[PDB]
């Protein structure tokens, strides 16, 4: 369930990538959805707001949406 | 009502776009006008204050304002 | 104790020495290195740094926050 | 590397040398000392010795699971 | 919210102990619940069939109950 | 119908007890039986195997049994 933010890069970056999925909670949490049906949670405020990575989930196709 | 930034980003970047207009709220959330009279919520905290989301959405003639 | 400065310069260095840096929520980052050693850093604003946690990751150092 | 035998040894010792474990679900223990080092024990088993986590408390270590 | 099992273990033989309830769930988590309105969870699978740990909290009146 | 651990064991302590029966099923599932017609459910794997707990529930004059 937990996922450290390296594993987390890591399965983005993934050119098979299982990541369908990402949440941006507003304290600093991710909640990081998988094409074959898991769900991570990542401990991460710095992720909150960095466009880059915003950018990168998006131009990825995958779903990204903040939660408060 | 509920939309996804990812979706969005999509709507926007349509080549025919529906989108009119968006509203940029100080709390976080977008709200996204169409032109067949829908309208979306979107929670996006990190795209209050995006110069180059604002200038994108400004040169794809869609409407932006702040309130 | 160690130092911010001597920090990033530990992570910047060229040989393998981080293995894995944890980013408390208090300021507080727990850096390990692979000879088994442990150190304390007393930096608030290092959740800040950007630069930093995207080198450490594209050296495929394990980081994690925790609270 | 540290042996389960070396690890009982080191917190039944007189002087306080470990600050902290960690029992994680793999079978794996965290050892950190005071002196700033931290070493690995593998130890299945750890998972049902309450003597030994007993003790640890007892001492004022901290001790926490993860997984 | 995360709570260490030593920390617990303080909360409980505290003389002035807030600790009014521990719920022990099947997968090794404790939920503990204070007096003063707050939830902490322990990671700690040694607990789930402690005998003696569970007695301690009985006797002291702590609601003590098992979940899946 | 659900009980807590601690309410079983102080109404089995209890100086005019109403429990009459308790039947302690594999999955950890205590069924608690009083005197006006009640019965109660409580998660406590812990107890499955206790003698203590056994002994004790039949010294009070307590049915228990295992199935």
Chains 1, 5 share one sequence.
Do not use: C, H
């Amino acid at each position: 369930s937990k996922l450290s933010y390296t594993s987390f890069v890591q399965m983005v970056e993934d050119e098979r990538s299982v990541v369908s999925e990402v949440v941006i909670r507003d304290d600093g949490v991710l909640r990081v959805y998988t094409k074959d049906g898991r769900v991570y949670e990542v401990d991460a405020p710095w992720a909150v707001n960095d466009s880059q990575l915003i950018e990168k989930l998006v131009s990825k196709g995958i779903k990204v949406s903040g939660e408060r």
